[PDB]
Every structure is written in structure tokens, then in C-alpha cells.
Amino acid sequence: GSAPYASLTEIEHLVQSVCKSYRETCQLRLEDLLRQRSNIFSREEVTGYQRKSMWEMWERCAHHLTEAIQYVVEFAKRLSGFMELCQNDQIVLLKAGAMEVVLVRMCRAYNADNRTVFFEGKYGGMELFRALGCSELISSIFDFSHSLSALHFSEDEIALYTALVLINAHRPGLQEKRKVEQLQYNLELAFHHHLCKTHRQSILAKLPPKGKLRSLCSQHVERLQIFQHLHPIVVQAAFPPLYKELFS
């Protein structure tokens, strides 16, 4: 809610609302992700991924990203106050934040014990993605996922944090910044109230620094442009239009 001077009751209500919105749009069930950790790609399966063509691997990954992004769009539409923002600002927030929210949600599917991620039905390491030809970015995403995993977030904490990743009043291009500032502040109050109640305010200092999500997203766009220049037709013919819209 964008309303000023939110009461304690309204703040508590917002905590429950954000968590509900998240639960309804979280894509995969956490319990499924956790119980599948012991399912790991074999050596031959990893080799199979590594022998895939660059275009096929980018095409798969673009599809998986777009799927995840679509659940984040649904999260935004359910998130208290978002649909009351003007449409220009809704688009600015999603165009900038959708990938950031996906990168944060992904820590759910990351196993810090063996540095693997859930991908197409089993867990694999960053060597699974070699055919993309962006090994430095992949390693950086694994590092980011690891940095978040170390905070051992609850699902409620992911709901509240990703709400603030999306509702960021600093995105350039907002036309009604004041309304985003108010929604952001109320969501900060909800996040903080929940953390104070649960003795978890310690995680605030450990959250990703200013610039880190920005860096990962900028590199994604750059590596995509590198790929696209090498394979222009594949993107026009086969990549999801929403993906092309957000990142080309």
C-alpha cells in the first residue's frame, strides 16, 4: 500500500500480504528443490551439456529465464500497491527489476554444500553452462547465489526482500517517484518489523551491496549482445519475445 503513515496493524497486514503474493507466485516448491539435491547430473550428462552448440544452450537458458520472469510479473501484479502505480512506472520497475528478482529467487535452487544449481531436472555445477561462452558471468552468478545462500533465508524473508528489489524508487525513468518512495518505505517497514520480530535484523548488513545486482544484470545484457551478434537469426526466430524486449 502506498498510503502514508502506515500503522502497526497496517504494517503487520502488509507483511502477511507480501508473503501471500510470494507464496502464490514462487514458481517451484522449496521442498521439491531441497529433496532433489541428491539428484546430480552424471559425468556423461555434464559432457552432453558441454557438447551442445552455443545457440542451443542460449536458447534453453533464455526460455528458462523468461519462464522465471513470467512468475515475477505475476508477483508484481499481486504485490500490494504495485498496480496502483502508473503504468509507465510499473514497466520501468519490471524492466529493471524482473531479472534482479529472478537472480535472488535462484538462491533457493542453489546448493552451497557442493556448489550446484537445479537445471532441467537435476543439480549441476557451473561447468554445465560452458557452451554459453560466458564463463566469468556464470561464475559470478554462482558466487552471488552462494553469498545469498549463506544468509539461509526463510521463504518469508525472500518474499519481503524481493518485494524491495522490485519496488526500488531509484530506477531511472520513474515519472511519479514520490509514490514509489512511499511504497518502498512501507515495504521497508514490513521487512524490518518481520526481521525484528524474528531476531533476524542481523541480515540487513549482509545483504548484497549496492551495485552487485546491477552488475550481474548489465553483464547478462552484454553477453546476450555478444551472442546475438554472432547468431542474429536465432534470437529473432527462436527466443521469447519478452526476453528480447527486456534484454536486447
Binding site: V73, K77, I91, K95, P241, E245
Partner: peptide, 8 residues
Amino acid sequence: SLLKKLLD
């Protein structure tokens, strides 16, 4: 845009 179409 596609975001617009997904949003309205």
C-alpha cells in the same frame, strides 16, 4: 510493449 500487454 509486451510488459504493457501482460500488465493490462
